[PDB]
Amino acid sequence: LTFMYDLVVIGGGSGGMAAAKEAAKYGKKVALFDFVKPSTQGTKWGLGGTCVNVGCVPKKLMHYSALIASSIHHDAQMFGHKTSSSFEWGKLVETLRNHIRMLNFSYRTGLRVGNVEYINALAKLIDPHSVEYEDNGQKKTITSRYILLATGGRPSIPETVPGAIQYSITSDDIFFLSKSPGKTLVIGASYIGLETAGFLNELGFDTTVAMRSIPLRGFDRQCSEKIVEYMKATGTKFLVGVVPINIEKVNENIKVSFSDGSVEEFETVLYATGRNPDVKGLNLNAIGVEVSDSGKIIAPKDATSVPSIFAVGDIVEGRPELTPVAVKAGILLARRLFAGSNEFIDYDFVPTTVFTPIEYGHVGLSSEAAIAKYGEDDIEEYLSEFSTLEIAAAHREKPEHLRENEMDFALPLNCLAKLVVVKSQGEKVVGFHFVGPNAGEITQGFSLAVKLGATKKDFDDMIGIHPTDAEVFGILEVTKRSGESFVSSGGCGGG
Amino acid sequence: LTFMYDLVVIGGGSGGMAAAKEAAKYGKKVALFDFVKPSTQGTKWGLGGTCVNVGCVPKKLMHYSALIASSIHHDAQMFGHKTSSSFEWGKLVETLRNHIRMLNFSYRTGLRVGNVEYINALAKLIDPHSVEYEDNGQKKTITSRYILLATGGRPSIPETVPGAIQYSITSDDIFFLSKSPGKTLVIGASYIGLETAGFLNELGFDTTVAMRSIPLRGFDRQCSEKIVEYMKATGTKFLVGVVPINIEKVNENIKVSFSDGSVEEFETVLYATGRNPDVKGLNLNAIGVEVSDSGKIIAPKDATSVPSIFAVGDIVEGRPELTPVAVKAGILLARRLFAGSNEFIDYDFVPTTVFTPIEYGHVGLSSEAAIAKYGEDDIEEYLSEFSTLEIAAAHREKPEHLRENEMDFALPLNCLAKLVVVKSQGEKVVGFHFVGPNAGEITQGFSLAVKLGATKKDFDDMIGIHPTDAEVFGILEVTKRSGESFVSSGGCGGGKCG
Ligand SMILES: Cc1cc2nc3c(=O)[nH]c(=O)nc-3n(C[C@H](O)[C@H](O)[C@H](O)COP(=O)(O)OP(=O)(O)OC[C@H]3O[C@@H](n4cnc5c(N)ncnc54)[C@H](O)[C@@H]3O)c2cc1C
Ligand SMILES: Cc1cc2nc3c(=O)[nH]c(=O)nc-3n(C[C@H](O)[C@H](O)[C@H](O)COP(=O)(O)OP(=O)(O)OC[C@H]3O[C@@H](n4cnc5c(N)ncnc54)[C@H](O)[C@@H]3O)c2cc1C
């Protein structure tokens, strides 16, 4: 038949490698293109895309290093381990690089063994069935029944702010810096911004976040603000309603001029203001692939305006930019194309965890989205704010430069549990929220239970595992409406 | 006046304090008795019972100290933190003691604020409505509509093994030793024994477990054996099918003579062989409260053979000896008696976690109980063995004394995920099992999902949180039956980046 391939995948990240391997499982001929355009600062990397190289994986290793710093500062001596420690940025980088190298190789092999032809070049569309790449500086064209776009995004730097592109780094550079970043400015109170600032502060760097308005826009306000309260109490500085308007090299430092007329010097400036979909090189306009006002491909069912051309992951408008969503969309697409499946993701139940110094895991609706959808009177919020048992016994203290009196000694309680329930459906759980340690580990299971239609009664009749934080979800009784105190001061942990 | 009290509770542990505070909530007059008989080695403590003083709370703080030791030995340098460290046993004890003291005080207050009359004396039954206690060396009797027994257990030491009672410690003593235990023998591959041996080894002590037969009897074999495999690779020694027959003091050490004719010196010997219900002081025989052959009270629905007398917690036959089971039974009993409730616990869905150096959380049936109940052919086991991402990148190594060659450097993979499903019910999940870090944190949620009737399909269509270990439960595909390798060697953690 008139096609060299059954499936050509442009992009070897979470979406692309998943689609490609699953297609190849059904005896289909599959080619995958992945090439890394260097960052605004010349950083590049191997196969596996944003999550493997410059996202979830390295961020989680840096978070782990941060939790180790925190445990050593706050906890080690109290639990009988008298420790002296010094942090060496280049050692942590070296451990990240070595683990990511192992994963680059692991994914190359996974593709070859999985009968996918991997090509390390930039691909572009020629027509609805044809893709072009260079190979020894010689354009080649290959034909496919089906084409999948999964090119992901890259960090966005404001072109209007002078010096930004030249002098600032992004998430593409932060995990691999040859030198420690020293005094750091992070612009963006997005999850990437807060996570990045959170681990740089925990690791002992002088850290400042420029937050234009509010933290974690779209996320539950109560939880988003508890995180910022905790980050402030552990030494992150926040400029609220302020952004850079100018960025200059003054000798070895970066002089940043702020929108409130203030000035401050930093060693490192990192933009975490968002990401644009990397689609400009794809030749979408000429082929008839429709894009939204944001530049994202219109494909609410993975199918673009061109019926031989599909898209998944961060480049698709109206879906969360998360790795598991990219992967499962790639696998389900592969099955629908080649195994007679008609299964899509249920986008109502996409859980997420933010890996801030205390983590935040949720699925379903914030208090705000719940109140907006069902009305204030059909909503109950059950919640509890408490300390992990082990942390309670550690007596974690504020740095002495942030003390306000003789009874402000303690860090905030590390945990917050909240269920958002609809009264007119026997208190059905429509929102689950947990701030605290291991929040992703806690939320995964609860997210399944919430998807299966768990009620507040189901949560009350649930037997707890003791001692855990997650057992708190079985004895929540204080409501926001009641106006009574949701703090628990006694240290039984999750209760 | 018919009865002085609505409810009298004998025992101020998890069951008793929960029943008592909940009864008092409904305007009922409530008395609670708690007194601590000293351990075989003279150790005593305040209000709150086994979990607060000599169980879950101190065990979990010692485990945390162990995780800290492990993180500093294995991980700190790799994650950029060059450290020097030394362990001080008495400092950890002091941090435990301070936190437990705060909890003793917190519970005294919680009872007074909650309108419960707390009495620090031993109580016994006089008849179906009467209990006796001493007070300034003067016997007093008080009358109640209802009496609740929640006296818990105490560690059991074999009377048959000479020197055992005199020279050995139990879980009652281990958290408060004034001196570090040094070289330690633990008898029992029960959860208490393994957890105890696990943290003493992690904390740098020369540790040995005398295991009569198998680890964690009643628990899933595959998971129980992964734990012992991991504990062995990190320095715990296991004597299999061997137990002490004699225990003697040679100077300041304890010479232990074993059933296989072998002999060895230890600084500390700890019996974790199990626990007997503390009911001998209660005068049960004379009142007509029926007990099993094990001495546990027969009360399958909390009601004893005497209908005014109830029981909850560790003393009741045929229920798990866990704190949340004690608490919820206490609360539900209080509600049935005084708030017109008719709710009992569903004993089919009681999750538990063992806090071994890698933890083990589960709910429902082992592979063994699943195969026995439904038959081998109506059972699928889906599983994956892998490493946490962070642990994978740390390259955790065996201690040099257990190395056999140049390729046995690595610790076992830290994680094992397993679902046990029934084919004839569209692969309904009847058993959930997770070995690895934060296993209780992972299991709590899944336990609820499994109770609500989650299928293998539900698990496969579940969106992952990345990077976690718990996302592995969304992509399990290898079956035991398939005989294929369930190991993954690459370090994407629980999930796949693609
Ligand atoms: C700092 C950070 C932290 C994150 N943390 C998490 C987290 O904790 N959990 C989570 O679930 N998600 C997380 N994410 C999100 C996650 O990284 C993405 O959602 C996911 O990687 C999306 O994958 P994708 O398949 O859309 O494409 P990507 O993984 O981004 O890969 C697309 C690939 O295409 C390549 N490419 C682009 N154009 C072409 C071309 N024309 N030809 C060939 N190759 C091309 C790119 O170089 C890239 O390799 C994080 C993201 C970032 C930036
Ligand atoms: C080492 C260890 C670790 C454990 N770890 C865990 C764990 O991690 N998770 C978990 O869920 N469970 C754990 N447990 C189990 C948990 O401690 C018990 O299941 C629970 O505490 C039992 O509660 P209870 O109400 O039956 O009795 P207890 O909590 O034992 O309290 C009974 C109280 O009554 C007192 N008493 C006895 N006789 C009388 C009398 N005549 N008059 C007055 N007072 C009396 C006792 O001294 C005690 O104070 C552990 C147990 C041990 C020993």
JSON list of C-alpha atoms in Angstrom, two decimals, chain A residues 27-196:
[
{"chain": "A", "resi": 27, "resn": "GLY", "atom": "CA", "xyz": [3.10, -5.36, 14.32]},
{"chain": "A", "resi": 28, "resn": "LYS", "atom": "CA", "xyz": [2.93, -1.83, 12.87]},
{"chain": "A", "resi": 29, "resn": "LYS", "atom": "CA", "xyz": [5.99, -0.19, 11.21]},
{"chain": "A", "resi": 30, "resn": "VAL", "atom": "CA", "xyz": [6.88, 2.82, 13.45]},
{"chain": "A", "resi": 31, "resn": "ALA", "atom": "CA", "xyz": [9.47, 5.65, 13.15]},
{"chain": "A", "resi": 32, "resn": "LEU", "atom": "CA", "xyz": [10.13, 8.14, 15.97]},
{"chain": "A", "resi": 33, "resn": "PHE", "atom": "CA", "xyz": [11.95, 11.49, 15.59]},
{"chain": "A", "resi": 34, "resn": "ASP", "atom": "CA", "xyz": [13.58, 13.18, 18.61]},
{"chain": "A", "resi": 35, "resn": "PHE", "atom": "CA", "xyz": [16.16, 16.03, 18.43]},
{"chain": "A", "resi": 36, "resn": "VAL", "atom": "CA", "xyz": [16.96, 18.53, 21.22]},
{"chain": "A", "resi": 37, "resn": "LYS", "atom": "CA", "xyz": [17.15, 22.23, 20.13]},
{"chain": "A", "resi": 38, "resn": "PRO", "atom": "CA", "xyz": [19.61, 23.82, 22.67]},
{"chain": "A", "resi": 39, "resn": "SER", "atom": "CA", "xyz": [18.06, 26.09, 25.38]},
{"chain": "A", "resi": 40, "resn": "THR", "atom": "CA", "xyz": [18.39, 29.93, 25.25]},
{"chain": "A", "resi": 41, "resn": "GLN", "atom": "CA", "xyz": [21.70, 29.28, 27.19]},
{"chain": "A", "resi": 42, "resn": "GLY", "atom": "CA", "xyz": [23.15, 26.44, 24.98]},
{"chain": "A", "resi": 43, "resn": "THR", "atom": "CA", "xyz": [21.99, 23.49, 27.24]},
{"chain": "A", "resi": 44, "resn": "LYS", "atom": "CA", "xyz": [21.19, 20.18, 25.43]},
{"chain": "A", "resi": 45, "resn": "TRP", "atom": "CA", "xyz": [20.52, 16.51, 26.41]},
{"chain": "A", "resi": 46, "resn": "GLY", "atom": "CA", "xyz": [19.65, 12.97, 25.17]},
{"chain": "A", "resi": 47, "resn": "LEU", "atom": "CA", "xyz": [16.44, 11.04, 24.35]},
{"chain": "A", "resi": 48, "resn": "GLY", "atom": "CA", "xyz": [13.33, 10.96, 26.62]},
{"chain": "A", "resi": 49, "resn": "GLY", "atom": "CA", "xyz": [12.00, 14.51, 26.41]},
{"chain": "A", "resi": 50, "resn": "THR", "atom": "CA", "xyz": [11.22, 17.12, 29.09]},
{"chain": "A", "resi": 51, "resn": "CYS", "atom": "CA", "xyz": [10.24, 14.81, 31.99]},
{"chain": "A", "resi": 52, "resn": "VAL", "atom": "CA", "xyz": [13.45, 12.63, 31.74]},
{"chain": "A", "resi": 53, "resn": "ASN", "atom": "CA", "xyz": [15.98, 15.39, 31.07]},
{"chain": "A", "resi": 54, "resn": "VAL", "atom": "CA", "xyz": [14.75, 18.80, 32.39]},
{"chain": "A", "resi": 55, "resn": "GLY", "atom": "CA", "xyz": [11.49, 18.16, 34.30]},
{"chain": "A", "resi": 56, "resn": "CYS", "atom": "CA", "xyz": [9.90, 15.65, 36.66]},
{"chain": "A", "resi": 57, "resn": "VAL", "atom": "CA", "xyz": [12.98, 13.36, 37.01]},
{"chain": "A", "resi": 58, "resn": "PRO", "atom": "CA", "xyz": [15.77, 15.90, 37.83]},
{"chain": "A", "resi": 59, "resn": "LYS", "atom": "CA", "xyz": [13.29, 18.15, 39.79]},
{"chain": "A", "resi": 60, "resn": "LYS", "atom": "CA", "xyz": [12.42, 15.10, 42.02]},
{"chain": "A", "resi": 61, "resn": "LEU", "atom": "CA", "xyz": [16.16, 14.29, 42.55]},
{"chain": "A", "resi": 62, "resn": "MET", "atom": "CA", "xyz": [16.80, 17.94, 43.54]},
{"chain": "A", "resi": 63, "resn": "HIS", "atom": "CA", "xyz": [13.69, 17.80, 45.87]},
{"chain": "A", "resi": 64, "resn": "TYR", "atom": "CA", "xyz": [15.17, 14.62, 47.46]},
{"chain": "A", "resi": 65, "resn": "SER", "atom": "CA", "xyz": [18.50, 16.46, 48.06]},
{"chain": "A", "resi": 66, "resn": "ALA", "atom": "CA", "xyz": [16.42, 19.30, 49.61]},
{"chain": "A", "resi": 67, "resn": "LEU", "atom": "CA", "xyz": [14.48, 16.88, 51.93]},
{"chain": "A", "resi": 68, "resn": "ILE", "atom": "CA", "xyz": [17.90, 15.49, 52.95]},
{"chain": "A", "resi": 69, "resn": "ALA", "atom": "CA", "xyz": [19.18, 19.04, 53.77]},
{"chain": "A", "resi": 70, "resn": "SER", "atom": "CA", "xyz": [15.93, 19.71, 55.76]},
{"chain": "A", "resi": 71, "resn": "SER", "atom": "CA", "xyz": [16.09, 16.34, 57.64]},
{"chain": "A", "resi": 72, "resn": "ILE", "atom": "CA", "xyz": [19.81, 17.03, 58.50]},
{"chain": "A", "resi": 73, "resn": "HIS", "atom": "CA", "xyz": [19.20, 20.67, 59.64]},
{"chain": "A", "resi": 74, "resn": "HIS", "atom": "CA", "xyz": [15.92, 20.07, 61.59]},
{"chain": "A", "resi": 75, "resn": "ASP", "atom": "CA", "xyz": [15.69, 16.36, 62.56]},
{"chain": "A", "resi": 76, "resn": "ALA", "atom": "CA", "xyz": [19.02, 14.46, 62.61]},
{"chain": "A", "resi": 77, "resn": "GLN", "atom": "CA", "xyz": [20.34, 15.74, 65.99]},
{"chain": "A", "resi": 78, "resn": "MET", "atom": "CA", "xyz": [16.87, 15.36, 67.67]},
{"chain": "A", "resi": 79, "resn": "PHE", "atom": "CA", "xyz": [16.73, 11.67, 66.55]},
{"chain": "A", "resi": 80, "resn": "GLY", "atom": "CA", "xyz": [20.25, 11.08, 68.01]},
{"chain": "A", "resi": 81, "resn": "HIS", "atom": "CA", "xyz": [22.36, 11.75, 64.87]},
{"chain": "A", "resi": 82, "resn": "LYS", "atom": "CA", "xyz": [24.72, 14.73, 65.62]},
{"chain": "A", "resi": 83, "resn": "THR", "atom": "CA", "xyz": [25.77, 15.78, 62.08]},
{"chain": "A", "resi": 84, "resn": "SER", "atom": "CA", "xyz": [27.89, 18.45, 60.40]},
{"chain": "A", "resi": 85, "resn": "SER", "atom": "CA", "xyz": [27.25, 18.83, 56.67]},
{"chain": "A", "resi": 86, "resn": "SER", "atom": "CA", "xyz": [28.28, 20.97, 53.69]},
{"chain": "A", "resi": 87, "resn": "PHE", "atom": "CA", "xyz": [26.46, 21.00, 50.33]},
{"chain": "A", "resi": 88, "resn": "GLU", "atom": "CA", "xyz": [28.41, 20.62, 47.04]},
{"chain": "A", "resi": 89, "resn": "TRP", "atom": "CA", "xyz": [26.24, 21.62, 44.01]},
{"chain": "A", "resi": 90, "resn": "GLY", "atom": "CA", "xyz": [28.48, 19.84, 41.40]},
{"chain": "A", "resi": 91, "resn": "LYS", "atom": "CA", "xyz": [28.22, 16.45, 43.20]},
{"chain": "A", "resi": 92, "resn": "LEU", "atom": "CA", "xyz": [24.33, 16.59, 43.02]},
{"chain": "A", "resi": 93, "resn": "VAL", "atom": "CA", "xyz": [24.53, 17.67, 39.35]},
{"chain": "A", "resi": 94, "resn": "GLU", "atom": "CA", "xyz": [26.92, 14.72, 38.71]},
{"chain": "A", "resi": 95, "resn": "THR", "atom": "CA", "xyz": [24.40, 12.26, 40.39]},
{"chain": "A", "resi": 96, "resn": "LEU", "atom": "CA", "xyz": [21.51, 13.78, 38.22]},
{"chain": "A", "resi": 97, "resn": "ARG", "atom": "CA", "xyz": [23.60, 13.64, 34.97]},
{"chain": "A", "resi": 98, "resn": "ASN", "atom": "CA", "xyz": [24.65, 9.95, 35.63]},
{"chain": "A", "resi": 99, "resn": "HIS", "atom": "CA", "xyz": [21.04, 8.84, 36.42]},
{"chain": "A", "resi": 100, "resn": "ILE", "atom": "CA", "xyz": [19.63, 10.77, 33.38]},
{"chain": "A", "resi": 101, "resn": "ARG", "atom": "CA", "xyz": [22.40, 9.24, 31.14]},
{"chain": "A", "resi": 102, "resn": "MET", "atom": "CA", "xyz": [21.28, 5.74, 32.31]},
{"chain": "A", "resi": 103, "resn": "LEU", "atom": "CA", "xyz": [17.64, 6.74, 31.34]},
{"chain": "A", "resi": 104, "resn": "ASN", "atom": "CA", "xyz": [18.70, 8.18, 27.93]},
{"chain": "A", "resi": 105, "resn": "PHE", "atom": "CA", "xyz": [20.34, 4.77, 27.17]},
{"chain": "A", "resi": 106, "resn": "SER", "atom": "CA", "xyz": [17.44, 2.75, 28.71]},
{"chain": "A", "resi": 107, "resn": "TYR", "atom": "CA", "xyz": [14.94, 4.58, 26.37]},
{"chain": "A", "resi": 108, "resn": "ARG", "atom": "CA", "xyz": [17.17, 4.17, 23.21]},
{"chain": "A", "resi": 109, "resn": "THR", "atom": "CA", "xyz": [17.24, 0.38, 23.95]},
{"chain": "A", "resi": 110, "resn": "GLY", "atom": "CA", "xyz": [13.48, 0.30, 24.86]},
{"chain": "A", "resi": 111, "resn": "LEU", "atom": "CA", "xyz": [12.68, 1.70, 21.38]},
{"chain": "A", "resi": 112, "resn": "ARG", "atom": "CA", "xyz": [15.11, -0.62, 19.47]},
{"chain": "A", "resi": 113, "resn": "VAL", "atom": "CA", "xyz": [13.90, -3.76, 21.41]},
{"chain": "A", "resi": 114, "resn": "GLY", "atom": "CA", "xyz": [10.25, -2.49, 20.99]},
{"chain": "A", "resi": 115, "resn": "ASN", "atom": "CA", "xyz": [10.77, -2.45, 17.17]},
{"chain": "A", "resi": 116, "resn": "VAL", "atom": "CA", "xyz": [10.60, 1.40, 16.77]},
{"chain": "A", "resi": 117, "resn": "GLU", "atom": "CA", "xyz": [13.06, 3.12, 14.34]},
{"chain": "A", "resi": 118, "resn": "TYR", "atom": "CA", "xyz": [14.57, 6.02, 16.41]},
{"chain": "A", "resi": 119, "resn": "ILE", "atom": "CA", "xyz": [16.04, 8.91, 14.28]},
{"chain": "A", "resi": 120, "resn": "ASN", "atom": "CA", "xyz": [17.97, 11.74, 16.08]},
{"chain": "A", "resi": 121, "resn": "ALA", "atom": "CA", "xyz": [16.90, 14.61, 13.72]},
{"chain": "A", "resi": 122, "resn": "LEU", "atom": "CA", "xyz": [14.34, 17.49, 13.53]},
{"chain": "A", "resi": 123, "resn": "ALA", "atom": "CA", "xyz": [11.28, 16.40, 11.46]},
{"chain": "A", "resi": 124, "resn": "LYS", "atom": "CA", "xyz": [8.76, 18.74, 9.73]},
{"chain": "A", "resi": 125, "resn": "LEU", "atom": "CA", "xyz": [5.44, 18.11, 7.85]},
{"chain": "A", "resi": 126, "resn": "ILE", "atom": "CA", "xyz": [5.56, 18.20, 3.99]},
{"chain": "A", "resi": 127, "resn": "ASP", "atom": "CA", "xyz": [1.86, 17.13, 3.58]},
{"chain": "A", "resi": 128, "resn": "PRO", "atom": "CA", "xyz": [-0.83, 15.09, 5.48]},
{"chain": "A", "resi": 129, "resn": "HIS", "atom": "CA", "xyz": [1.23, 11.83, 4.93]},
{"chain": "A", "resi": 130, "resn": "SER", "atom": "CA", "xyz": [4.91, 13.02, 4.59]},
{"chain": "A", "resi": 131, "resn": "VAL", "atom": "CA", "xyz": [7.67, 14.17, 7.02]},
{"chain": "A", "resi": 132, "resn": "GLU", "atom": "CA", "xyz": [11.13, 15.65, 6.10]},
{"chain": "A", "resi": 133, "resn": "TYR", "atom": "CA", "xyz": [14.46, 15.38, 8.05]},
{"chain": "A", "resi": 134, "resn": "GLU", "atom": "CA", "xyz": [18.18, 16.13, 7.40]},
{"chain": "A", "resi": 135, "resn": "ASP", "atom": "CA", "xyz": [20.68, 13.20, 7.47]},
{"chain": "A", "resi": 136, "resn": "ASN", "atom": "CA", "xyz": [24.36, 14.08, 6.62]},
{"chain": "A", "resi": 137, "resn": "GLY", "atom": "CA", "xyz": [22.91, 17.47, 5.45]},
{"chain": "A", "resi": 138, "resn": "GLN", "atom": "CA", "xyz": [20.64, 15.66, 2.91]},
{"chain": "A", "resi": 139, "resn": "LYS", "atom": "CA", "xyz": [16.85, 16.21, 3.19]},
{"chain": "A", "resi": 140, "resn": "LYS", "atom": "CA", "xyz": [14.96, 12.87, 3.26]},
{"chain": "A", "resi": 141, "resn": "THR", "atom": "CA", "xyz": [11.16, 12.40, 3.03]},
{"chain": "A", "resi": 142, "resn": "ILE", "atom": "CA", "xyz": [9.20, 9.37, 4.37]},
{"chain": "A", "resi": 143, "resn": "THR", "atom": "CA", "xyz": [5.45, 8.59, 4.14]},
{"chain": "A", "resi": 144, "resn": "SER", "atom": "CA", "xyz": [3.02, 7.35, 6.85]},
{"chain": "A", "resi": 145, "resn": "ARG", "atom": "CA", "xyz": [-0.68, 6.33, 7.13]},
{"chain": "A", "resi": 146, "resn": "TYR", "atom": "CA", "xyz": [-0.73, 8.26, 10.47]},
{"chain": "A", "resi": 147, "resn": "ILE", "atom": "CA", "xyz": [1.46, 11.09, 11.93]},
{"chain": "A", "resi": 148, "resn": "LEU", "atom": "CA", "xyz": [1.56, 11.91, 15.69]},
{"chain": "A", "resi": 149, "resn": "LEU", "atom": "CA", "xyz": [2.86, 15.31, 16.88]},
{"chain": "A", "resi": 150, "resn": "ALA", "atom": "CA", "xyz": [4.26, 15.21, 20.47]},
{"chain": "A", "resi": 151, "resn": "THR", "atom": "CA", "xyz": [7.04, 17.89, 20.33]},
{"chain": "A", "resi": 152, "resn": "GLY", "atom": "CA", "xyz": [6.23, 19.27, 23.84]},
{"chain": "A", "resi": 153, "resn": "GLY", "atom": "CA", "xyz": [6.94, 22.87, 24.95]},
{"chain": "A", "resi": 154, "resn": "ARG", "atom": "CA", "xyz": [10.06, 24.91, 25.87]},
{"chain": "A", "resi": 155, "resn": "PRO", "atom": "CA", "xyz": [10.39, 27.60, 28.58]},
{"chain": "A", "resi": 156, "resn": "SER", "atom": "CA", "xyz": [8.91, 31.03, 27.68]},
{"chain": "A", "resi": 157, "resn": "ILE", "atom": "CA", "xyz": [10.99, 34.19, 28.37]},
{"chain": "A", "resi": 158, "resn": "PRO", "atom": "CA", "xyz": [9.27, 37.61, 27.92]},
{"chain": "A", "resi": 159, "resn": "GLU", "atom": "CA", "xyz": [10.79, 39.31, 24.74]},
{"chain": "A", "resi": 160, "resn": "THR", "atom": "CA", "xyz": [9.42, 42.73, 25.99]},
{"chain": "A", "resi": 161, "resn": "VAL", "atom": "CA", "xyz": [11.62, 42.73, 29.21]},
{"chain": "A", "resi": 162, "resn": "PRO", "atom": "CA", "xyz": [15.14, 43.87, 28.15]},
{"chain": "A", "resi": 163, "resn": "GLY", "atom": "CA", "xyz": [18.12, 41.61, 29.10]},
{"chain": "A", "resi": 164, "resn": "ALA", "atom": "CA", "xyz": [15.76, 38.63, 29.95]},
{"chain": "A", "resi": 165, "resn": "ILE", "atom": "CA", "xyz": [16.67, 36.35, 26.94]},
{"chain": "A", "resi": 166, "resn": "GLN", "atom": "CA", "xyz": [20.42, 37.16, 27.22]},
{"chain": "A", "resi": 167, "resn": "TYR", "atom": "CA", "xyz": [21.06, 36.89, 31.01]},
{"chain": "A", "resi": 168, "resn": "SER", "atom": "CA", "xyz": [18.26, 34.66, 32.52]},
{"chain": "A", "resi": 169, "resn": "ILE", "atom": "CA", "xyz": [18.21, 30.83, 32.74]},
{"chain": "A", "resi": 170, "resn": "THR", "atom": "CA", "xyz": [15.10, 28.52, 32.64]},
{"chain": "A", "resi": 171, "resn": "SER", "atom": "CA", "xyz": [14.21, 24.94, 33.83]},
{"chain": "A", "resi": 172, "resn": "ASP", "atom": "CA", "xyz": [16.20, 23.78, 30.74]},
{"chain": "A", "resi": 173, "resn": "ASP", "atom": "CA", "xyz": [19.46, 24.99, 32.45]},
{"chain": "A", "resi": 174, "resn": "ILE", "atom": "CA", "xyz": [18.95, 24.80, 36.28]},
{"chain": "A", "resi": 175, "resn": "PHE", "atom": "CA", "xyz": [19.64, 21.01, 36.75]},
{"chain": "A", "resi": 176, "resn": "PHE", "atom": "CA", "xyz": [23.04, 21.13, 34.86]},
{"chain": "A", "resi": 177, "resn": "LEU", "atom": "CA", "xyz": [24.69, 24.46, 35.91]},
{"chain": "A", "resi": 178, "resn": "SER", "atom": "CA", "xyz": [28.52, 23.96, 35.98]},
{"chain": "A", "resi": 179, "resn": "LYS", "atom": "CA", "xyz": [28.52, 26.31, 39.05]},
{"chain": "A", "resi": 180, "resn": "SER", "atom": "CA", "xyz": [26.10, 26.74, 42.01]},
{"chain": "A", "resi": 181, "resn": "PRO", "atom": "CA", "xyz": [23.57, 29.52, 41.24]},
{"chain": "A", "resi": 182, "resn": "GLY", "atom": "CA", "xyz": [24.28, 31.60, 44.42]},
{"chain": "A", "resi": 183, "resn": "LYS", "atom": "CA", "xyz": [21.72, 34.34, 45.23]},
{"chain": "A", "resi": 184, "resn": "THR", "atom": "CA", "xyz": [18.73, 33.49, 42.97]},
{"chain": "A", "resi": 185, "resn": "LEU", "atom": "CA", "xyz": [15.60, 35.25, 41.64]},
{"chain": "A", "resi": 186, "resn": "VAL", "atom": "CA", "xyz": [12.76, 32.97, 40.36]},
{"chain": "A", "resi": 187, "resn": "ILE", "atom": "CA", "xyz": [10.02, 34.81, 38.34]},
{"chain": "A", "resi": 188, "resn": "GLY", "atom": "CA", "xyz": [6.72, 32.86, 38.48]},
{"chain": "A", "resi": 189, "resn": "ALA", "atom": "CA", "xyz": [4.65, 31.49, 41.40]},
{"chain": "A", "resi": 190, "resn": "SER", "atom": "CA", "xyz": [3.63, 28.62, 39.02]},
{"chain": "A", "resi": 191, "resn": "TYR", "atom": "CA", "xyz": [4.32, 25.03, 40.28]},
{"chain": "A", "resi": 192, "resn": "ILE", "atom": "CA", "xyz": [7.70, 25.03, 38.45]},
{"chain": "A", "resi": 193, "resn": "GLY", "atom": "CA", "xyz": [8.68, 28.42, 40.09]},
{"chain": "A", "resi": 194, "resn": "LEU", "atom": "CA", "xyz": [7.64, 27.42, 43.64]},
{"chain": "A", "resi": 195, "resn": "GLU", "atom": "CA", "xyz": [9.21, 23.87, 43.37]},
{"chain": "A", "resi": 196, "resn": "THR", "atom": "CA", "xyz": [12.47, 25.41, 42.01]}
]
